[PDB]
Write a protein that binds this DNA or RNA. Structure first.
Lengths: 111, 116, 48, 146, 100, 143, 50
RNA sequence: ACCGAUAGUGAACCAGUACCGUGAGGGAAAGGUGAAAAGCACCCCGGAAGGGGAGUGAAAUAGAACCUGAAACCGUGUGCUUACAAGUAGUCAGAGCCCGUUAAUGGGUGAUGGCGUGCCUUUUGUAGAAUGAACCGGCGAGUUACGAUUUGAUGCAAGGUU
RNA sequence: UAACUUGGGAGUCAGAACAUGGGUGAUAAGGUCCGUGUUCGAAAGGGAAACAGCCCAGACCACCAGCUAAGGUCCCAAAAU
RNA sequence: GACAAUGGUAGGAGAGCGUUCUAAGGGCGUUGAAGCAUGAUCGUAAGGACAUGUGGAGCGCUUAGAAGUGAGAAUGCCGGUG
């Protein structure tokens, strides 16, 4: 059927994550983990975690073969941003947005 | 008593955003640009009804003139042929009669040249 | 009768309320014309 | 208003070199938390009108009621007795003489019934009522008054 | 076999079995109605036209009597605080042309 | 109401061929542009090209009037600073007549997206031989 | 300088047309059984054998 | 015929408190699970967080970042359309393609053609290269007391009125 | 078919160009000051390419009807090669 | 019926819509109120209904009365977000 895994308040910017998520969307689940292990980006490990949890939820709660599971969807959504401040010069000060993201992945057999 | 403005501003602004859909970009999202473009739309529509009348008048004259030239006349010489032979039909009907029946428009052109 | 009351025809009028829109007639400047000593909150010169 | 809200009395910034709008206090109306431009003030609402118009309004209310029982006899205040008295004869205005303090008590608990006396006939009381139950004496006292 | 009927200050090229739309006529729903302002008749049949053909007429069944889509009439003068909104549902009557 | 509009399946298009020998340039160009936009025909609608394909031949033979051969300088700018070019009609009639007649005609058609469709229905040859034998071109005389 | 006019969210996405990152250019290891990255040591089990 | 969390006290919350100042002194933001904690036992992925089931529950997209949950804004998917074209982005006409309503001359898109230099303010006169507005949401400006004056209504009338 | 009177309520006291009679200037100025008129101000529509004031003409609203106005009829661009 | 009028800035006059509350009357509502989302709906405008989702407990309607009664502009204030 379909099995999802969501990771919430992952402390990475969401458009530093959609870079990687634009790769493994539509792919098989084997090459997906291959890519997510081989890539240089810092979003790969957390997305490795999430995609492996998606596959495990499939094979444990829904019992669909972990051989034909294709990543139907994968997307990041914004989250609660931590707003910080940085001392500029001459007494000024500039905001900083330590933003977060919610990483959802949905693997489905396609049947 | 106190009367805090609630769900009365929203209602009319929503009413104005529904009214502007199909617009490029923030014209259909934002209110202070959607209102301006809705006003411009109303003014343009007011103007364009009158100009619609004018446009079709031009087009009818153009096609009647294209028909009469295939019958060795003008628009002007023909339309004087009519109204001097005997008062007749208007331009829209006369054009689409020249379109549908090529066989009655020449009836009229002979009866018009008969007006000399 | 206390749920159908009718003041005598011609007695009451609703007050004039300026500075609310431009379709009433007294909205933008609110009946004061443009700039000047009398278009300022604080009245004009004293009477006389 | 501005004079009453706490704090203020300090121009926040300098008015000239900041780049922000020029402000005078943080307790001005356009801010939040300071200043109501107009509004409520503790003030009365009553007014008057001539004696003759007052009396004519009372006469007109009774006139539209016309458009009367014997004396009430209630030793003890017993609301069921009063409910029976109202059923044998529900916006009732039971008008009595000076005051019978066993008919007001017998009747103040019934919803829709209002009791009063000939010296205390309102116009809101009358026009709120669907019926008038005035005694033989109260009819004569009000014919004497008005 | 068509014709040209003058109805409401406008000519209309009308054949049989056709549904037409005209400005408001006084008749009610589902009624006959004879057009006399016919200035030109005949297609493949004959080609006769006078100021008014005066021998031919048309007969139509009054199919319906209603009001068009509300067009809103908005317009404003910029920088001079003047604007004006109206509405308009132009009433029409639709007819079936029964015979010519 | 009823006003026939030309569609993609309504339209027809024809091929004409006009001798450009002995004709004044503009007196011919107006006729040709009329044909190109397509208002020799009764199914004229503005938002489509109901006009025809035209083949102007003998473009090395058009005639000017008066001192227009030596005068009537055509200019063109190259969008580089100071670079403007010029050519007189006499030198453009022997060097490139098929650009003389084309520029005359295309200045009489609108500058729109549909006016360029119509602009590229004109086929101009300096000579009496045009390779469009496979199109059934018709004679045409100046009305 | 400073931007004279705020950028639409059309021009933005057009400019981010090329903000992709390609895949690494990997292969499968004939020994490890899994995906390695070409011309590199196999992550999973050991050898290179080139 | 007082407010209802930007309101009402500066303070509905451990508030004259964080914080700011050498100091006198200035000064915020911060409410809502559920009828009842019944507040998620157990299993799986994970280092944990976080999830997916399984249960509590009337409801868990009521899971303590907990009543509804708008808009700006950020995304994923898809029906119509766009890489020879000069665009205050609409409006009138209009093929083609896709659907199917508060069922009535239907809805979405839009090849193409005609017309068309935003809004306020201030000005003799602004597309103006004069002002002002990043966008969204909320708050934000002729009021009340007492006198005078004229108008409408009502009541009496050489009297009227407290 | 307006006019005056007596009442309540205002706004205006920066005007502009065009024709015309003058002053000033230099028979300069889209200059400046006055008499008379028109339009803009507060006026959209058509013509003057574009263009408040120039010529025509005063928009209650709908119409895929007709007649004219300034101005025009080779093509762009409606109507006379 | 017939005729006549209906550009408009400062400004003058009239008629109205809508919001919160109050009185009276009469009603709807856990068989689902307010609100929010969508819609191809009715009115000359301000605007008024209706249907479906969401929501979970209060709201209309007539007639009067009283106003903290309507926001796009203040280098407006606070929050969020580009």
């Amino acid at each position: 059927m379909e099995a999802k895994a969501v990771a919430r308040t992952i402390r990475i910017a969401p458009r530093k994550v959609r870079l990687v998520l634009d790769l493994i969307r539509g792919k098989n689940a084997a090459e997906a983990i291959a890519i997510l292990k081989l890539t240089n980006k810092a979003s790969s490990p957390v997305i490795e975690k999430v995609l492996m949890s998606a596959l495990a939820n499939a094979e444990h709660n829904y019992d669909m073969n972990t051989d034909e599971l294709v990543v139907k969807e994968a997307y990041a959504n914004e989250g609660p941003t931590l707003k910080r401040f940085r001392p500029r010069a001459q007494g000024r000060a500039s905001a900083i947005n330590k933003r977060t993201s919610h990483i959802t992945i949905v693997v489905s057999d396609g049947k | 008593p106190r009367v805090k403005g609630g769900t009365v501003t929203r209602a009319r602004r929503k009413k104005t955003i529904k009214l502007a859909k199909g617009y490029f970009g923030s014209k259909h999202t934002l209110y202070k640009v959607a209102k301006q473009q809705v006003m411009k739309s109303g003014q343009y529509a007011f103007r364009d009804r009158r100009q619609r009348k004018r446009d079709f008048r031009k087009l009818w004259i153009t096609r009647i003139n294209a028909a009469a030239r295939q019958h060795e006349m003008s628009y002007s010489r023909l339309m004087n042929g009519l109204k001097k032979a005997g008062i007749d039909i208007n331009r829209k009907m006369l054009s689409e009669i020249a379109i549908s029946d090529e066989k009655a428009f020449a009836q009229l052109v002979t009866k018009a040249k008969d007006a000399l | 009768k206390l749920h159908e009351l009718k003041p005598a025809e011609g007695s009451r009028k609703e007050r004039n309320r300026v500075g609310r829109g431009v379709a009433t007639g007294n909205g933008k400047t609110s009946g004061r014309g443009h700039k000047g000593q009398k278009a300022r909150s604080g009245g004009g010169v004293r009477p006389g | 208003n501005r004079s009453a809200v706490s704090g203020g009395g300090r121009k926040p910034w300098k008015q000239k070199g900041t780049g922000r709008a020029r402000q005078g206090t943080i307790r001005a109306p356009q801010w939040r938390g300071g200043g109501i431009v107009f509004g409520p003030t503790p003030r009365s609402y009553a007014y008057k009108m001539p004696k003759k118009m007052r009396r004519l309004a009372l006469r007109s209310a009774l006139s539209f009621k016309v458009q009367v029982v014997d004396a009430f006899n209630f030793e003890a205040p017993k609301t069921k007795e009063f409910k029976n008295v109202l059923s044998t004869l529900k916006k009732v205005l039971v008008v009595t003489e000076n005051e019978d303090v066993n008919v007001e008590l017998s009747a103040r608990n019934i919803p829709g019934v209002q009791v009063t006396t000939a010296q205390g006939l309102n116009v809101l009381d009358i026009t709120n009522a669907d019926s008038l139950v005035i005694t033989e004496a109260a009819a004569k006292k009000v014919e004497e008054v008005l | 076999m068509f014709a040209i009927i003058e109805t409401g200050g406008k000519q209309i090229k009308v054949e049989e079995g056709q549904e037409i739309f005209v400005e408001k006529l006084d008749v009610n729903e589902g009624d006959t109605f004879t057009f006399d302002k016919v200035l030109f008749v005949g297609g493949d049949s004959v080609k006769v036209g006078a100021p008014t053909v005066e021998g031919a007429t048309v007969t139509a069944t009054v199919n319906k009597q209603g009001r068009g889509k509300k067009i809103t009439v908005f317009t404003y003068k910029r920088r001079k605080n003047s604007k004006r909104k109206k509405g308009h549902r132009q009433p029409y009557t639709k007819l079936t042309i029964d015979k010519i | 109401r009823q006003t026939f509009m030309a569609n993609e399946s309504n339209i027809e298009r024809k091929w004409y061929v006009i001798d450009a020998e002995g004709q004044t340039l503009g007196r011919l160009s107006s006729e040709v542009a009329s044909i190109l936009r397509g208002k020799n025909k009764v199914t004229y609608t503005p938002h489509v090209d109901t006009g025809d394909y035209v083949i102007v031949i003998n473009a090395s033979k058009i005639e000017f009037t008066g001192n227009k051969e030596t005068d009537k300088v055509y200019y063109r700018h190259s969008n580089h600073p100071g670079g403007i070019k010029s050519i007189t009609a006499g030198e453009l009639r022997r060097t490139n007549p098929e650009r003389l007649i084309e520029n005359s005609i295309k200045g009489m058609l609108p500058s729109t997206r549909l006016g360029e469709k119509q602009g590229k229905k004109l086929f101009v040859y300096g000579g009496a031989e045009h390779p469009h034998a496979a199109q059934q071109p018709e004679n045409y005389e100046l009305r | 300088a400073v931007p004279k006019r705020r950028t639409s969210k059309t021009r933005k996405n057009k400019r981010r047309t090329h903000f992709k990152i390609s895949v690494p250019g990997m292969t499968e290891c004939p020994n490890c059984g899994e995906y390695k990255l070409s011309h590199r040591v196999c992550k999973n089990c050991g050898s290179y054998n080139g």
